[PDB]
Design a protein around this ligand. Structure first.
Ligand code: MG
Ligand code: MG
Ligand code: MG
Ligand code: MG
Ligand code: MG
Ligand code: MG
Ligand code: MG
Ligand code: MG
Ligand code: MG
Ligand code: MG
Ligand code: MG
Ligand code: MG
Ligand code: MG
Ligand code: MG
Ligand code: MG
Ligand code: MG
Ligand code: MG
Ligand code: MG
Ligand code: MG
Ligand code: MG
Lengths: 292, 159, 208, 172
RNA sequence: GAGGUAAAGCGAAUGAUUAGAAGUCUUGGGCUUAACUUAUUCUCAAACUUUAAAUAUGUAAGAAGUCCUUGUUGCUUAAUUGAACGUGGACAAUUGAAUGAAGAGCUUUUAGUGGGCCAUUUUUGGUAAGCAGAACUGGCGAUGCGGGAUGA
RNA sequence: CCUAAGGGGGACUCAUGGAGAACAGAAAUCUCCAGUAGAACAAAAGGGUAAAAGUCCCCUUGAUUUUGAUUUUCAGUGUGAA
RNA sequence: GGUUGCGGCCAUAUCUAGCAGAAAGCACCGUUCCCCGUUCGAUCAACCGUAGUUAAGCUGCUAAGAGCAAUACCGAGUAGUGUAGUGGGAGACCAUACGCGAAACUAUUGUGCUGCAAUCU
């Protein structure tokens, strides 16, 4: 009764979007605004702090874009944190802060700007930007790229922001998206921000849940229970981790249990292979014959 | 009433290519232009800022100025009995590097390499390009290729 | 009313069709393009005879109507109304203009009539019939030729009816099960697409 | 693999939407909103007419209808309270091809709430959107995709699930 | 490099359009007609189009070039990065396609003119016109001479 | 003609069709699916635009100051506009 | 080789209908004290990685698949066209000479390639 829509003309005239837009992964509007560089700064690249959250991991990368593809400068993942002493809550706002601090320290070590631009060595939660030192190189400038993730006051991407800013990178930002920002009275409550930096919210949940719902405390905070980690010593886990991250921010790759060839040979066993033209012609001939 | 507006007659010139509408791929914004570069001008209809006039659509020129998002291009236009130097400000979406530079610069590199190697081998080489010359003599073998005789065909109607 | 056709014989202007730009255009005199037994199957009328243009020219809708009527009347009178299927292959889509119906000021004309722009070798009329009805169909077209200006040729087609296949390739594809009826026309077998649907639609398909 | 008796293929209610399309604006619509807030415990939202129709007495952007969306156990409670009014007998023609179903009560006191002369009686519309786990794929911002054909909810599956879960009847 | 005219296309979008056939009417009436849907069919577009010429058109084919080394700045870079302009060094007449070149470049000053017309080809209005209006070129005007008997 | 129909940011996706829901029916409101834009973008027409240039929301005055360069029409004068 | 993050070109990558998927990743998935946003913790925010699952997403494979791309003793040196004649023809138009040269059609083949970082039976 109604016209069939998916005609051959519909498919012929359909213009498919960009591959990574159809994947729903790249916002090319924002990407153009982030990447495009002043034409009189000819080959000087703009550096992005790409911050992406998965269900289990925090990915922070410093990236510059080129015609053949993006090039990673350094990268810090949340699963590197256990090396530094954070094994649980690998997606906290505080885990985000630690990852941002780690990527900042690693980038500055790679560049050579360690003694200059140390950052906020005494984290009190105050809003601060990395100021340049007179008669010295300017701080490494990086712009935050949160991708498709929504901008909300209290979001974890700005946790990675705050960690990277305190780590010595100059990343331009405002404090009105941090946890503890009073929108009515436009000032930042640094006490609550420091709480979030050192897992204060998580510790308060532990304390509030333990005396109200012990069974839920046992299921949600199992790993802490078998690790004998209470609320009062939650903060120290981060406070030490910070210090260790500043002590040795260098990247240590995981020792690989197999070689590239072994990985490839194992994976190739589970990969279906395309039928040859002759094979599918033979299948067609067989189906015709069995159709008589 | 005659109409001679800025974009008159650009109905097809300023159209996007079929199945090529929408966002600009970012290699356009990643290319680097220096003063003295030779660039083609091709208006992109989806960017209306910094758009060239229809005369410069399809022209090639020299970059003379580099600004935040644009380049200044020098074009020579015939006005009566002489050329006038025109200075056009174009956003980089309407600009592309000219491919004639890389070919001539490659012939320069190849000539330098051939001349130095010929000097190393102690011989001489001629570097001037040559037009296609008439072909030389040749012998056509007919083993397996004995000439087939054709004739004009009679008239037929095929409808 | 109507000027002599000589005033509009030649394709001097660009095509001027009905559009959103000219709207008050009269109708063509020809409205019927298929006559005779238009529902006959392809196998019933193997012989095709064409009236072909040897002119780059314009034919009015009035001439198209007159020739259609003349050919139809003669062929139905001599051989019966169901012994043929006549098709007029040119549609008048070009609007002629008339000025008088001051001086040369504002002389852009008003729609006056419709004409078909025909090329050299363009088919004007096609008549599919049986072989035994050749001389009749030919004389029907030869009479219709008088209603047209210029030179036209009566050409006996090499093909089966209104199909694009010769009278031997059609028989080969018919005995090979590659042709099925579609009412007045046929559908041909394709070696592309869904194999099962192709086989179902052409059951007698002797695959090689 | 691809086993139909998988845990994640379980049908369950996504949302229940309660609609009262009072044809006018003002006191009647306000009292209908009061009824909806009473039943659901949630502030309802008023919908405006998309265009003007003189026959129906509505105009564009005039607040006409009121509706509310409930999810979870509260949706289940309201749905079974309404199925009591329907005496657990829907029609085969109450289920859409996409696996959703709906019915409409005519008096809101049949649901089991107290009647007030000031409020009056409003009829009400119930619609239940069915869905399995993984529907977040079609609603999330990043990497949004479509649901595979086998994981989709359809009319036959929804009818069978309704008959099993409510011991009710679907009048074919 | 650019182009969207000729051609082509319409079982490709838009718009126009001839004919049957098979289904659905469940939201048309009296087996029936008419609607739609599906696969087909005839014919079209200066102000339609996926495609797309020929002719015409932009740029380049070096010494003011290419490569190597390292100076200036308040611009620019996280930078010791660049941008521009440079010092110093190497590559010599096949110095980097053809053909031609009563030489190239530059300046001042002033006359007449600012009714045009014709032919081929492209082309608009008009039934057409030794009609009216455009495109490119060549002519007449401004030009005699041989031919078209005669004739811008 | 417009204090937004200007500027910035964010969120959302349009025309239309199908299948469903009391009154409710061809057209009210609700839901899902399909939907390359077949919608919309002040006004002619053409071009352009889909995580937007469209719809809705938040904040605003870059519709500000200074005087040069350039493009179009062009005599390479003015005006307008960019 | 698989996978993820960020990409380049932007369908050989899209679309429809099926099937398979080890490891890790990704994902769905669980919860609402806290920052935050909603008619609705569905989306968005936060928390746990603890209770579960490859069902879906994703990836690959299948189809005389639609589409798309490429190629060509396919059509066709056809249509068109630059240049020429005191060529033909009443004309409409056409042929010839020196050059350039399509589109549809037909057939065949293919169905993402790839850069940086990290990771994995
Ligand atoms: Mg954004
Ligand atoms: Mg174009
Ligand atoms: Mg503007
Ligand atoms: Mg004319
Ligand atoms: Mg044009
Ligand atoms: Mg044409
Ligand atoms: Mg074509
Ligand atoms: Mg068409
Ligand atoms: Mg004078
Ligand atoms: Mg004068
Ligand atoms: Mg005068
Ligand atoms: Mg004179
Ligand atoms: Mg003379
Ligand atoms: Mg003489
Ligand atoms: Mg004479
Ligand atoms: Mg606007
Ligand atoms: Mg605004
Ligand atoms: Mg926006
Ligand atoms: Mg000027
Ligand atoms: Mg001006």
């Amino acid at each position: 009764m109604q016209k069939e829509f998916r005609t051959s003309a519909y498919h012929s005239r359909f213009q498919t979007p960009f591959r990574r837009r159809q994947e729903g992964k790249t916002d090319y509007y924002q990407r153009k605004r982030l990447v495009t560089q002043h034409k009189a700064k000819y080959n000087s690249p703009k550096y992005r702090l790409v911050v992406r959250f998965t269900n289990k991991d925090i990915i922070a990368q410093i990236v510059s874009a080129h015609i053949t593809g993006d090039v990673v400068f350094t990268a810090a993942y949340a699963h590197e944190l256990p090396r530094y002493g954070i094994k649980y809550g690998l997606t906290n706002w505080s885990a985000a802060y630690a990852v941002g601090l780690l990527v900042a320290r690693r980038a500055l070590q790679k560049l050579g700007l360690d003694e200059t631009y140390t950052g906020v060595e005494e984290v009190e939660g105050e809003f601060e930007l990395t100021e340049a030192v007179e008669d010295g190189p300017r701080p490494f400038k990086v712009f935050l790229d949160i991708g498709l993730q929504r901008t909300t006051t209290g979001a974890r991407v700005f946790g990675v922001l705050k960690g990277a800013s305190d780590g010595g990178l100059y990343v331009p930002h405002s404090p009105n998206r941090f946890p503890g920002w009073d929108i009515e009275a436009e000032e930042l409550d640094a006490e609550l921000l420091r709480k979030y930096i050192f897992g204060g919210h998580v510790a308060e949940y532990m304390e509030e849940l333990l005396d109200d719902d012990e069974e839920k405390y046992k299921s949600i905070f199992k790993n802490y229970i078998e690790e004998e980690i209470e609320s009062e010593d939650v903060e120290e886990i981060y406070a030490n981790a910070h210090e260790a991250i500043r002590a040795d921010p260098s990247f240590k790759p995981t020792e690989k249990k197999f070689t590239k060839e072994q990985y490839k040979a194992e994976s190739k066993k589970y990969r279906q292979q395309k039928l040859t033209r002759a094979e599918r012609q033979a299948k067609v001939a067989k189906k015709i014959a069995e159709f008589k | 009433g005659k109409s001679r507006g800025y974009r008159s007659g650009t109905r097809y010139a300023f159209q996007r290519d079929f199945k090529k509408h929408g966002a600009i791929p970012l290699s356009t914004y990643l290319k680097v232009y220096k003063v003295g570069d030779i660039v083609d001008i091709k208006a992109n209809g989806s960017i209306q800022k910094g758009m060239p006039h229809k005369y410069y659509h399809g022209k090639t020129g020299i970059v003379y100025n580099v600004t935040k998002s644009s380049v200044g291009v020098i074009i020579n236009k015939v006005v009566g009995n002489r050329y006038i130097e025109k200075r056009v400000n174009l956003r980089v979406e309407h600009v592309k590097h000219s491919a004639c530079r890389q070919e001539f610069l490659n012939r320069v590199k190849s000539n330098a390499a051939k001349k130095r190697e010929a000097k190393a081998n102690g011989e001489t080489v001629y570097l001037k390009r040559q037009a296609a010359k008439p072909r030389g003599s040749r012998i056509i073998s007919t083993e397996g290729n004995i000439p087939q005789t054709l004739a004009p065909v009679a008239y037929e109607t095929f409808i | 009313a109507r000027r002599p056709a000589r005033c509009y014989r030649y394709c001097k202007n660009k095509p001027y069709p009905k559009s959103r730009y000219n709207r008050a255009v009269p109708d063509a005199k020809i409205r019927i393009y298929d006559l005779g037994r238009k529902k006959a199957t392809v196998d019933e009328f193997p012989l095709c005879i064409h009236l072909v243009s040897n002119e780059l020219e314009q034919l009015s809708s009035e001439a198209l109507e007159a020739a259609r009527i003349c050919a139809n009347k003669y062929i139905t009178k001599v051989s019966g109304r169901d012994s043929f299927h006549l098709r007029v292959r040119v549609h008048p889509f070009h609007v002629l203009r008339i000025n008088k119906m001051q001086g040369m000021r504002g002389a852009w004309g008003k729609p006056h009539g419709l004409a078909a722009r025909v090329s050299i070798g363009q088919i004007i009329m096609s008549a599919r019939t049986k072989d035994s009805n050749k001389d009749v169909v030919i004389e029907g077209l030869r009479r219709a030729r008088y209603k047209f200006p210029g030179q036209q040729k009566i050409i006996i087609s090499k093909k089966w009816g209104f199909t694009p296949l010769n009278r031997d390739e059609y028989i080969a594809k018919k005995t090979n099960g590659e042709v099925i009826d579609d009412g007045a026309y046929v559908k041909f077998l394709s070696r592309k697409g869904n194999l099962e649907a192709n086989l179902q639609q052409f059951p007698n398909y002797q695959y090689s | 693999s691809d086993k139909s008796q998988n845990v994640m293929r379980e049908l369950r209610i996504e949302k229940l939407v309660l609609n009262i399309c009072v044809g006018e604006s003002g006191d009647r619509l306000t009292r209908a909103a009061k009824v909806l807030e009473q039943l659901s415990g949630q502030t309802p939202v008023q919908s405006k007419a998309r265009y003007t129709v003189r026959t129906f007495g509505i105009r564009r952007n005039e607040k006409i209808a009121v509706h509310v969306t409930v999810r979870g156990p509260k949706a289940e409670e309201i749905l079974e309270r309404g199925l009591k009014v329907k005496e657990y007998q829907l029609r085969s023609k109450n289920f859409s091809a996409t696996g959703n179903f709906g019915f409409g009560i005519d008096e809101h006191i049949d649901l089991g709430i107290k009647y007030d002369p000031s409020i009056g009686i409003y009829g009400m519309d119930f619609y239940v959107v069915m869905g399995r786990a993984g529907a977040r794929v079609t609603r999330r911002k990043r990497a949004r995709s479509t649901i595979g054909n086998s994981h989709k909810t359809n009319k036959e599956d929804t009818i069978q699930w309704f008959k099993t879960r409510y011991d009710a009847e679907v009048l074919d």
